[model samples]
Target chain A: DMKDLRGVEEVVIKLKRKEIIIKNPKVNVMEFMGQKTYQVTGKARERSLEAEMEIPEDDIELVMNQTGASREDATRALQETGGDLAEAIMRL
Target chain B: DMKDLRGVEEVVIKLKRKEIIIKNPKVNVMEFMGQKTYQVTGKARERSLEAEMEIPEDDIELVMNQTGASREDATRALQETGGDLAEAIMRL
Candidate 1:
């Protein structure tokens, strides 16, 4: 996948590249499985700017099938991750 | 003339691959350049990126246009520095 591992319901720094200026800063980096692609109707308090991103299934599957991680926990654990897929895997 | 060179609003790696990965591990990449492509835009910012990139260009003199570095300076320099047409003329 691309570094754009960085998008969703809200905005994020794609923190992986935050140390640099090469991150995707657009809002709604990727829409949640539900809701309109242009709209956000997910839980509000559940959102936080510092740690918000949508990790779709394929990425989780990749980690689980390739890196031995659990899909059940990858998404939430990935939230605190700095937008680096591999880094997130290592965190797992 | 269209290798996803650049865009008014784009973040394309091309349906064509411009760079190499370890044969794996590119992370969750582009979503196939959707209407939201530019929304996810940012270059790899690596010179290696340029080197590996396919320089899209017009094939003929009669071929009018193509894609390449934008600044007039870079465009002009590239033409004479030997691009498709010139490089072709030069080779001839």
Candidate 2:
């Protein structure tokens, strides 16, 4: 028998230095003779933790207060602008 | 200025004992007077690391061979079934 798992949006595999992300994946499972097996099909990508940049809390707060943007957006803009408050705000 | 970033699938905040995950989030940024702030509006959920279970390599491999499933599916099934090869296979 084969079973298809539905409504799975994302799957993440964590490793030492990086993680593999599979988005909007198709998953299937097979069972035969009291044994089971699994399968996953999707676009897989790698994200390196070493390359992850940290944005300061104060900077994030400043961006939010000034623009009323969400923390996620503030953090992302700061990162994209290389921690430049002026540029981050403008970008937002 | 307020900026809305598009196409962000997921955001994860790693902590010592657990992680906070926000899926398909809405992010915005604000800037004022050379300062910036951020706000995140989404459904935030916490996943505890203390209960993270480890499945044995042999068990995972055995399940895969028996069911012809991908490593990800095999590992997930095993975990969901509490490391029971028989139950994992059946569930798959």
Candidate 3:
């Protein structure tokens, strides 16, 4: 038996450093001998994970210098403060 | 100019009563007469928003009976207690 799975909007697959996104695609399920297999076809796109981590290196450095915080802490503070340099320093 | 947006994992479109989920979709930006249009295509699926609001009527009723609370209060208490009947009653 083959059937179409309908009303799908978007699908996302996450990888180590990238993501694959599909939009408005068709999905199908086929059953053979009680085993089901799903197939998806659509317009697919890729995005870089690096872009999402947009914390600037300079901001992290500045926070670290001002707060004497470790690199990881500085980066986390910067991220928590939405890259606000002064706030990141104060948070640390 | 047309460019592909890369590394997108999922896109969600919310409607009044349903959600359209697209998995692993392709997204593109096209620039025309100083305007940019985005196109997304992927494997799409629809899920009813009703399924997410799964507060049981019996739980609401039980809380109301025990606490003498309004329907809205009973429902909110039940939700906050994660359907714990006694806890929901005491919360009110």
lDDT (10s digit) by residue, model 2, range A2-54: 89989998778899966666767899989888888868887555455433345
Instruction: State the lDDT of candidate 2 residue by residue for B1-92, as single tens digits.
Output: 79887878887886534467787888888899998776667776555442135688999999999999999999878766657899999887
DockQ (CA atoms), all models? 0.01, 0.02, 0.04
Model 3 residue B51 distance off true place after TM-score fit, in angstroms: 7.3
RMSD of 1: 19.0
Instruction: Give the number of the best model, judged by TM-score.
Output: 3
- Candidate 1 lDDT tens digits, B11-50: 3343332442232122232333221121232344322322
Q: What's the i-RMS for candidate 2 in angstroms?
A: 12.1
> Which runs in model 3 stand beyond 4 Å of their true positions?
A1-53, B1-9, B27-40, B51-92
Tens digit per residue, CA lDDT, model 3, B1-92: 67899998998889977889999999988755434577889999998753223477888888888889999888877756656788887789
Winner of 1 and 2 under DockQ: 2
What value does the lDDT take at residue B86 in candidate 3? 83
Residue A14 in candidate 2 has what lDDT? 92
Pairs in clash, predicted candidate 1: A1-B27, A1-B28, A1-B29, A2-B28, A2-B29, A7-A29, A7-A30, A8-A29, A8-A30, B60-B63
Q: Give per-model TM-scores.
A: 0.22, 0.30, 0.38
| i-RMS for every candidate | 20.4, 12.1, 14.4
Chain A TM per prediction: 0.37, 0.48, 0.47
lDDT of 1 by residue, A1-92 (tens): 11232354343223332422222334332333222243223332322344444466777776677667677666665656634578777877
For model 3, how does the per-residue alpha-carbon lDDT over A1-92 read when each residue is reduced to its tens digit?
Answer: 66888998988889977899999989987755434577889999998664233576777788888889999888877756656787877777
